[PDB]
Amino acid sequence: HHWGYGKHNGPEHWHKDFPIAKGERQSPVDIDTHTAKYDPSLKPLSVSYDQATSLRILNNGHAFNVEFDDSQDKAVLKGGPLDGTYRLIQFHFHWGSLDGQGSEHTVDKKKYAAELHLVHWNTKYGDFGKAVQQPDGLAVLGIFLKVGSAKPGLQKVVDVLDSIKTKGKSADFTNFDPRGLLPESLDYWTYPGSLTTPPLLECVTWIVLKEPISVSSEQVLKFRKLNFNGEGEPEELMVDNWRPAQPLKNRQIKASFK
Numbered sequence: 001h002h003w004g005y006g007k008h009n010g011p012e013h014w015h016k017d018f019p020i021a022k023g024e025r026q027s028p029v030d031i032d033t034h035t036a037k038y039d040p041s042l043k044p045l046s047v048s049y050d051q052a053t054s055l056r057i058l059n060n061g062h063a064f065n066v067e068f069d070d071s072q073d074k075a076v077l078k079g080g081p082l083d084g085t086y087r088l089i090q091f092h093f094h095w096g097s098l099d100g101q102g103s104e105h106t107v108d109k110k111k112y113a114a115e116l117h118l119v120h121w122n123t124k125y126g127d128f129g130k131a132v133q134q135p136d137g138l139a140v141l142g143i144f145l146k147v148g149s150a151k152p153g154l155q156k157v158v159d160v161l162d163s164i165k166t167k168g169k170s171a172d173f174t175n176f177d178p179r180g181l182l183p184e185s186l187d188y189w190t191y192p193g194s195l196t197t198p199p200l201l202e203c204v205t206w207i208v209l210k211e212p213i214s215v216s217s218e219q220v221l222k223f224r225k226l227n228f229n230g231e232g233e234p235e236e237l238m239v240d241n242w243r244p245a246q247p248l249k250n251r252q253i254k255a256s257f258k
């Protein structure tokens, strides 16, 4: 009876196994655009992905992860609110059953169709497992998806999903360039938060881009054909794998822009 996003094991249940679910810095949150303050002291954000080495794509039974070689400083996030160097380890998405829901963060209570999370760990802690035990251990770059024009840089991901339909399936996924998933502007909001999946550790600096990327209806429809189940089990479509907005509590959301 493990956590998930079903009727009986969804986000409202997670506190029973993970009491930090009701903690002081849980994610995601609603970004109230009128309450977020411009912080002119935020340094410019540095996304250095030209040397990124993608390795593999995995269906982990609640999303799919694109994993990178993070055994050296190739693909790194620096600047903005961050002290030091954060190495890209994986990206994944959250999405909906319908275009009107799917994102984890919301903007003035608006839900986007999906949300991309590029997960990075703080290299001063030496490995990801040590970093998630620290209040500044991770940095996640969050990017909203809206449905409209296709995102050409997403299609290589869409086209491999047929090969990882069910939980525990993986496929080689080399030479994927995550720069193709970025919007034009790097304007962002930032706040201290958590993992949005169990174990919900309070170890994340969130950096959420203001500009959404556009993907096509056909692209998001292919996300919704994945399965939560393993092979040879009753089909349960992988949709609505998002945690809703959590209380902001004693936190301020800072804007990089006026």
Ligand SMILES: NS(=O)(=O)c1cc(-c2nnn[nH]2)c(NCc2cccs2)cc1Cl
Residues within 6 Å of the ligand: 060, 065, 089, 090, 117, 119, 128, 138, 140, 194, 195, 196, 197, 204
């Ligand atoms: N939604 S999120 O707050 O961005 C988050 C979600 C996951 C996730 N959910 N399920 N599987 N991974 C994650 N895993 C990191 C790694 C995966 C494998 C080796 S390290 C990290 C973060 Cl910060």
Ligand SMILES: [Zn+2]
Residues within 6 Å of the ligand: 092, 093, 094, 117, 196
């Ligand atoms: Zn995520």
